[PDB]
Amino acid sequence: HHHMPMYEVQWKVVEESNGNNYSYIDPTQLPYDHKWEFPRNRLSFGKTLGAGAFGKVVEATAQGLIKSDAAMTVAVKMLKPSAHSTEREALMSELKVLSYLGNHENIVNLLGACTHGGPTLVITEYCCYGDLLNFLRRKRDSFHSSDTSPASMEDDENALDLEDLLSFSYQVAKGMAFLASKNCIHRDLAARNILLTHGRITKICDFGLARDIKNDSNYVDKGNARLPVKWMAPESIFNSVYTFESDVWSYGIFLWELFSLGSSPYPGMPVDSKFYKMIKEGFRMSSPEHAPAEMYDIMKTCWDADPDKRPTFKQIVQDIEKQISES
């Protein structure tokens, strides 16, 4: 019998509880709208896009999904036959939360599902550049400064510049604002959980069971879970408190990764009792090299120990939209 926090960090929808508190919704209670049902036969599977112990995501072709006589590339999340009922429930619950959330430009969107007969298939948008973290890392050496000739890079047209990084930061804040408006808390926001598509649109996601979490050292064995500690707010680490404001903390850590072009957070600071002490005492990362001062300012406010002093995603969107206008 699996403890699911060992295998993924589940997003949560919250509902108003007593007084000013929120409580988690049990996602198995959410409805699955059968308008999403899509014939299993009209799918043709290609390469695997990610896999963990019990789940995988694989690229596929779907016949007639969006237009009656047209095919389109999609990504399909599904479980391996060795999965347990606890994973099969988690995947249906993920489908129910997707059916509840609706559609947004900056999330990986639900396109359809196969829920009768064999395994649950969750059909979502395919993003051809893959995860943003790997993209930033392979694009790292070709990042180009403002007033520099295009002739110095080979693929200057495919290179990375500050305009891209500000754009990615803006689109992720917009996706997170959407999530928060549906009372959704992601709980595992990070560049590894953001995809990049045609036109360089970023889409938030979570590989979840399709990630080999035991071999991703960004997840630390803490209690009986595997937790992305370096991305988490202190209240989540120490009191297991997850709110819209803890997502903002993670967004600040994402910004640091983004403007460091995929560097790993808190270098020279392995997760141990020393790490936890320094975070409590107010240690915070310095500005990434390519981060403009105003983006580093957002980062610092994202990391306020007092959750009420952190920006909301709605405010962050306003801030970054203005920074983009002014340049």
> What residues are annotated to the active site?
188
Q: Which of 206, 207, 309, 205 is nearest to 249 (CA)?
A: 309
Cβ neighbours of residue 318 under 8 Å, at least 6 residues apart?
Answer: none
Residue closer to ligand P31 by CB (options 122, 298) is 122
CA–CA separation, 227 vs 188, rounded Å?
A: 9
Residue of 11, 100, 168, 249 interacting with ligand P31 (CB under 6 A): 11
- Judged by CB under 6 A, the number of residues near ligand P31 is 22
Residue closer to ligand P31 by CB (options 57, 232) is 57
Residue of 108, 160, 172, 237 interacting with ligand P31 (CB under 6 A): 108
Residue closer to ligand P31 by CB (options 184, 285) is 184
Phi/psi at 298 (5° precision): -55, -45
Rounded least distance, CB 256 to ligand P31, Å: 20
Binding status of residue 7 toward ligand P31 by CB under 6 A:
no
- Residue that is written with structure tokens 């979840």 in the block: 208
What burial class does residue 301 get, using C-beta atoms within 10 Å of its C-beta: 0-12 exposed, 13-18 middle, 19+ buried? Answer: middle
Tokens linked to 258: 């983004």
Binding status of residue 92 toward ligand P31 by CB under 6 A:
no
Binding status of residue 211 toward ligand P31 by CB under 6 A:
no
Residue of 43, 123, 173, 205 interacting with ligand P31 (CB under 6 A): 205
Binding status of residue 192 toward ligand P31 by CB under 6 A:
no
**In the chain, which ranges are E strands?**
12-16, 22-24, 43-51, 55-63, 71-79, 110-114, 121-125, 130-131, 184-185, 194-196, 202-204, 220-222, 225-227
Rounded least distance, CB 17 to ligand P31, Å: 22
CA–CA separation, 109 vs 130, rounded Å?
A: 15
Binding status of residue 204 toward ligand P31 by CB under 6 A:
yes
Positions in the binding site for ligand P31 (CB under 6 A):
11, 49-50, 57, 75, 77, 94, 107-108, 124-127, 130, 179, 186, 195, 204-208
